[PDB]
Structures are given as structure tokens and as C-alpha cells.
């Protein structure tokens, strides 16, 4: 059934699985009309589909044209996500298709279930974890490719850079979730932490800076401080 703290280690076993997050598929700015009414203008979005064991990120970019003339976009977005995940699965060789797909919001279950009826053996599951994948657009290189897209496009990343050379996927995921939680709680502080040292750069083929093992420990400490910090500034504790 659902995914939570009790079965957390299942993410790093050898059954292929994908997280799907649809938070950033349908994105708008809200603004005033000349008549003083309110209207939205959509902006490009993305589906965040992640293999937590390998770090492979299938970033499907949702170009604003996909909404033209459509109604009920928030509902449509869940079905468009499902359509694109189903298309991704069908494009993968059989030995690469996932045995499970975990959605980060329960409203994706029925759309994805329906789009995957052809794959009765792929388990579609919710989770009780409050994962911070919404913050993916706070990673500059992901935000950049999304905003620059002039047409639908799939881009592939390893969201763990080269981390798996030195640490396990459990640790790699833990780091990623801590970074994304910080970016979600205070993006400016988080980025200042990441980027206040010019001696540590982001390689052209990477998303995050080239921290040594010790620097990552320092960085992780600062991110936990910030999350507690803002949790005080928020709750006055």
C-alpha cells in the first residue's frame, strides 16, 4: 500500500521504482487585468520523476502550449502527468520498467492507475512522507532548462551528481531531501549556504557543488540549523 517511515529502506533495494511528483506541472503567476479583474498566465512546468536508488531524474518539461484552449487545468495536469509517466514507462526496455511507482500526492493515484492499466504488474502507491520535491525548481540548472524550453522536452539528469561513488543511495537520498527541504523552507539562506564559497564550484555536468566529504558534513549541519532556525522564526520558538 502506502510508503512511510516504517518501510523507508524499500526505496534502496533492487526493485526498480520511481517517485512521481506533479507539484510543478501546472504553474501560474496571478495578476490584475486592466479592468481590475484577476487572471492567470501559465508558465512552463515539469514532471519530477526520480529513481531514488540510482539518482536518475527524468525531467519532463511541460510547455505552456499544452494548456491552450483547455479547461480545468489543475485537473488536466494530473492526467497529463499520468499520460507522460505512462509514455515514459512504455519507452523503457522491459528490464528497465519500474515494478512500483510512488506518487507524492494521492490525487495522482487514479489518473496514474488508469493510464497504466496495460501494466497490471506495476504497483501504483501513495506515500505518507512529506517529501520536498516541490523545491526542485530551486535547483538553478533545472529551473533554467524548464524556463528556456520552447517546446515539450524530456531532459535526463542524475540528481545525486557523483555522490554514489562515495556514499550509499540511502545517504544520497537523505542528503537530497535535506537540501530540498532547506531550499523549500528558506531558498535564499539555503542557496547562500551552498554558494558562499567560490573555491567550491559546480561542475558543468553536475547540479550541486563539488564539496569534499568534510565540507558536505559542514554543509549538512548548516542546512539542519537553517531548518530549525526558520522553524523558530516561523513558530517564534
Amino acid at each position: 500500500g502506502a510508503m512511510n517511515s516504517s518501510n523507508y529502506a524499500e526505496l534502496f533495494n533492487n526493485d526498480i521504482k520511481l517517485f512521481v511528483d506533479d507539484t510543478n506541472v501546472y504553474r501560474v503567476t496571478v495578476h490584475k487585468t486592466f479592468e481590475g479583474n484577476v487572471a492567470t498566465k501559465a508558465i512552463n512546468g515539469c514532471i519530477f520523476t526520480l529513481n531514488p536508488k540510482t539518482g536518475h531524474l527524468f525531467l519532463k518539461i511541460i510547455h505552456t502550449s499544452v494548456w491552450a484552449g483547455q479547461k480545468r487545468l489543475s485537473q488536466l495536469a494530473k492526467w497529463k502527468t499520468a499520460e507522460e509517466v505512462s509514455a515514459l514507462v512504455r519507452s523503457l526496455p522491459k528490464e528497465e520498467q519500474p515494478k512500483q511507482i510512488i506518487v507524492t500526492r494521492k490525487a495522482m493515484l487514479d489518473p496514474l492507475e488508469v493510464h497504466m492499466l496495460d501494466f497490471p504488474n506495476i504497483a501504483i502507491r501513495p506515500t505518507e512522507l512529506r517529501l520536498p520535491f516541490s523545491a526542485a525548481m530551486s535547483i538553478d540548472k533545472l529551473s533554467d532548462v524548464v524556463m528556456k524550453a520552447t517546446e515539450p522536452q524530456m531532459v535526463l539528469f542524475n540528481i545525486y551528481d557523483d555522490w554514489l561513488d562515495r556514499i550509499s543511495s540511502y545517504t544520497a537520498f537523505s542528503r537530497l531531501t535535506l537540501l530540498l527541504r532547506a531550499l523549500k523552507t528558506n531558498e535564499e539562506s539555503a542557496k547562500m549556504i551552498l554558494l558562499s564559497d567560490p573555491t567550491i564550484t559546480i561542475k558543468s555536468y553536475h547540479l550541486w557543488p563539488s564539496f569534499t566529504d568534510e565540507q558536505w558534513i559542514t554543509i549538512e549541519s548548516q542546512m539542519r540549523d537553517l531548518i530549525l532556525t526558520e522553524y523558530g522564526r516561523k513558530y517564534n520558538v
Partner: protein
């Protein structure tokens, strides 16, 4: 006016005949039910005094043969039997009537309840659901599972209702996934009405038959089937106007007849609120909505 003769009543039992029920004591001198209206299917049903577990009974049509009930002390139930010797049959019934040993099917002349509950239930169509070809009547009980329940275990003793499953390739056209899931008109009108049932009369008959097995036997798979057939219509944006109007009449008499004290178990809150307040047909079932609101507002 036809008759169902009982050889006797050796065990204390509550006897149902359509929407009526009466008590017979153990070894009471009882020889059956007379004045049964010709032209309708009927159901005769049983609940033993000593074990209200297992309601059971028989769907029959008097035009299809002469039928009698005989208790079987080995299998422990009232069985329906066909008597092929028509003379011997009329002879025994006439003796039982002369001695006034039969209760009277007590139809009030104003009353169209049974007609309205059974308008599209045929006996040959009932046999398509309850498979036992050597008899002209069909046995049902509380515990019989449906062919769909057995997909999720004796196939001989199952109720073969039409399988309805909203998250199935049958229900969903490739390339129309959101369309067909959010508006089930394709599944209703093309898959079910045109390709399985052939007409809405047939669609209503199975729905009527699932309701009555739910109500008279507490048969859970039947209740599931009744609610699924309602929900398929209510969830379709495009339904013939005459099917909606008839559906409203059908459900009205079902809700009217339901025992007040069983509404908590026989009525699915989610389906009914969806159908009356959220679905495409939320404005189309005026009679059903009025009786539901005045009779079971707690379910809503």
C-alpha cells in the same frame, strides 16, 4: 391466480412471498400460498426460526410450470420442486384450498409496488445470472458470491452478474483515459447498453434483480452490483432522457420499499451522495432525491 402447495411445515420458519412475510410454527398445519398474481416473476424465501443465518429462496414464474415446496430433513431446508403431473397437481391444490390450509397472497388493488420493483426481471434472464439449467426456478441465498467477487469460490453456486469495473480496459479507451474515467458515457452506452445488454430494459432488469437479492437475502455482492449499475448511469454525462426518467422511477420504489431499519447497511453513502449531489445526473432524479431526503436524510 396461481398456487404454490407445501407438503408441510416441519420446522418453524419465517416465509417471504415477494415483499410480504408471515410466520409458520413448527408442524403448524400449513399447505402453501394461493392467489399469486400471474404475469410477474416471484420470489419465495425463508428464514428459519432456529438459525436466522442463511436467508434463502427461489425465483419462479407460475407460467413456467407447477411448483411446490417440500422440506428436506437431510439438507435441512425448504426446497422448491416442479410437479409434471398436472392433474395430480391440480387435485392436491384443490384439496388444500377446500380445507382452507393456504394463506392468501394479499395484493391490495391500488398497489403497483411489486410490478414497479420487477418491471424488467424475466425468468429466462434470471437463469442467465443463476446457472442451474435442470430447474425452471432459481435458488439464491445470503452467502452466494458473484463472478466478480470470485475474481478478487465454487463457480456452480455463483451469481453471474455483468462485470462492471471503472478502472478496467473495458471501461477505458486508450487515448481517452481522462475523458472516459470522468464521463462514463462510452462504457454505459457503447460497451454495456449496445454490446452486452442490447437495450436499457435489460440494463434495468439486472439492476432491479441485484436490488431485490440484496434486500431479501442480504446478499452483499448483489448490493455491490446494484450500486455499480446506478453509479455507471449517474457518472455518464450522456444518457437517454427516457432512461433517466425510468431510473428515477425505479430507484424511487426501491428506496420506498427498503426496510427503514436496514438502510444503514443496504445503502452506500458514497454512491448516493455522489449520484444525487455531485454527478452529471445530480438534477435528473427528482423523485428519488425527494424520497431519499425525506426518508434517509441522515445518510446525507
Amino acid at each position: 391466480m396461481n398456487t404454490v402447495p407445501f407438503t408441510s411445515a416441519p420446522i418453524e420458519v419465517t416465509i417471504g412471498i415477494d415483499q410480504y412475510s408471515f410466520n409458520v410454527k413448527e408442524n403448524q398445519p400449513f399447505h402453501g400460498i394461493k392467489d399469486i398474481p400471474i404475469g410477474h416473476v416471484h420470489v419465495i424465501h425463508f428464514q428459519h426460526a432456529d438459525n436466522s443465518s442463511m436467508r434463502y429462496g427461489y425465483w419462479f414464474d407460475c407460467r413456467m410450470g407447477n411448483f411446490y415446496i417440500q422440506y428436506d430433513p437431510k439438507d435441512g431446508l425448504y426446497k422448491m420442486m416442479e410437479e409434471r403431473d398436472g392433474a395430480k397437481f391440480e387435485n392436491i391444490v384443490h384439496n388444500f384450498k377446500e380445507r382452507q390450509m393456504m394463506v392468501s397472497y394479499p395484493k391490495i388493488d391500488e398497489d403497483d409496488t411489486w410490478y414497479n420493483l420487477t418491471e424488467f426481471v424475466q425468468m429466462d434472464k434470471i437463469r442467465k445470472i443463476v446457472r442451474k439449467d435442470e430447474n425452471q426456478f432459481s435458488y439464491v441465498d445470503s452467502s452466494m458470491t458473484t463472478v466478480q467477487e470470485n475474481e478478487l469460490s465454487d463457480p456452480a453456486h455463483s451469481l453471474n452478474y455483468t462485470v462492471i469495473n471503472f478502472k478496467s480496459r473495458e471501461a477505458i479507451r486508450p487515448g481517452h483515459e481522462m475523458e472516459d474515467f470522468l464521463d462514463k458515457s462510452y462504457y454505459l452506452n457503447t460497451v454495456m447498453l449496445q454490446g452486452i445488454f442490447k437495450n436499457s430494459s435489460n440494463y434495468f432488469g439486472e439492476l432491479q434483480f441485484a436490488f431485490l437479492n440484496a434486500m431479501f437475502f442480504g446478499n452483499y455482492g448483489s448490493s455491490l452490483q446494484w450500486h455499480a449499475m446506478i453509479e455507471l448511469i449517474c457518472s455518464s454525462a450522456t444518457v437517454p432522457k427516457h432512461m433517466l426518467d425510468k431510473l428515477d422511477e425505479i430507484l424511487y420504489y426501491q428506496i420506498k420499499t427498503l426496510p427503514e431499519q436496514y438502510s444503514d447497511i443496504l445503502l452506500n453513502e458514497r454512491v448516493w451522495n455522489i449520484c444525487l449531489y455531485s454527478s452529471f445526473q445530480k438534477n435528473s432524479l427528482h423523485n428519488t432525491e425527494k424520497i431519499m431526503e425525506n426518508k434517509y436524510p441522515e445518510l446525507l
